[PDB]
């Protein structure tokens, strides 16, 4: 009994610094990624040339209209996206095929590129894993290691990396994650909620301004 | 098990459990110290303050 307990504790410990080393590596990678973008922009400005950042592979989509008076095409699309309520949020692998799909539900959803804090804030607080078709909160790393252990995801930091950086197993990581059930935004929306964001409304693409909405949502 | 969901962002102990890296994170690091190099191409300034 003592040998088994010691063996359990040891292997569990060896898993712990493994998580610690991975999380440290991801944090260093993020800082090195932001440093290089700043250096690339600075040197381009110094040379008079211009630099185009990478277009982010990750998008966060929030549904902003109720389940009423929606055309069946938009209804089916949001069913595919798993946006079955207002304020529901999802991480989607933004690519060529997703863009035209979102062009149809543009009046009904708003989307933009989330930053590290937003994706970290959402998973820690609104993060509920989908285990055995049940909505289970991510209260420990045991759930993550037992549900995504076949894709080398062992902790919350590993899941955050696979989501934020759009890893090879992004589909599995996102599908494991129940849609975020965000609250109504503190402070409220704009005067009109159902115009285009570019026209003073709230629907449609908003790029780096989705973070400001998410802070109110949380 | 898990009778109540505790937010790691408001409860330090839960954050410690889920993230065994918050013990040594060191968010605020010195990169700029003082020796800042003002770098902007004169062509960029001209095209910026153009028209």
């Amino acid at each position: 009994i003592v040998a088994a307990a010691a063996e359990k504790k040891s292997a569990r410990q060896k898993k712990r610094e493994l998580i610690a080393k991975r999380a440290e590596a991801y944090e260093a990678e993020y800082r090195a990624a932001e440093r290089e973008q700043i250096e690339l922009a600075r040197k381009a400005r110094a040379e008079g040339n211009y630099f185009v950042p990478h277009e982010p592979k990750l998008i966060f989509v929030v549904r902003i209209r109720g389940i009423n008076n929606i055309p069946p095409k938009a209804r089916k699309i949001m069913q595919l996206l798993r946006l079955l309520q207002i304020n529901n949020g999802i991480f989607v692998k933004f690519n060529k095929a997703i863009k035209e799909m979102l062009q149809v539900v543009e009046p009904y959803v708003t989307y933009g590129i989330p930053n590290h804090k937003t994706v970290r804030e959402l998973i820690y607080k609104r993060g509920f894993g989908k285990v055995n078709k049940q909505r289970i909160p991510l209260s420990d790393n045991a759930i993550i290691e037992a549900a995504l252990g076949k894709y080398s995801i062992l902790s919350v930091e590993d899941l955050i990396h696979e989501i934020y950086t759009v890893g090879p197993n992004f589909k599995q990581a996102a599908n494991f994650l129940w849609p975020f059930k965000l609250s109504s935004p503190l402070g409220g929306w704009r005067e009109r909620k159902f115009k285009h964001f570019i026209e003073g409304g709230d629907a449609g693409k908003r790029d780096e301004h989705i973070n400001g909405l998410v802070q109110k949502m949380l | 098990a898990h009778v109540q969901k505790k937010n790691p962002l408001k409860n330090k102990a839960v954050l410690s459990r889920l993230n065994p890296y918050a013990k040594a994170y060191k968010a605020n690091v010195k990169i700029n110290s003082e020796k800042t190099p003002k770098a902007a191409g004169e062509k960029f300034l001209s095209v910026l303050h153009e028209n």
Binding site: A44, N49, Y50, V52, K96 | -
Partner: peptide
């Protein structure tokens, strides 16, 4: 098709021209 990657856009050959509607 993946998103367009970061690249360079040399303007010394074609300096930006001011456009007015």
């Amino acid at each position: 098709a993946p998103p367009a990657k970061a690249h360079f856009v040399s303007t010394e050959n074609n300096e930006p021209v001011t456009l007015h509607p």
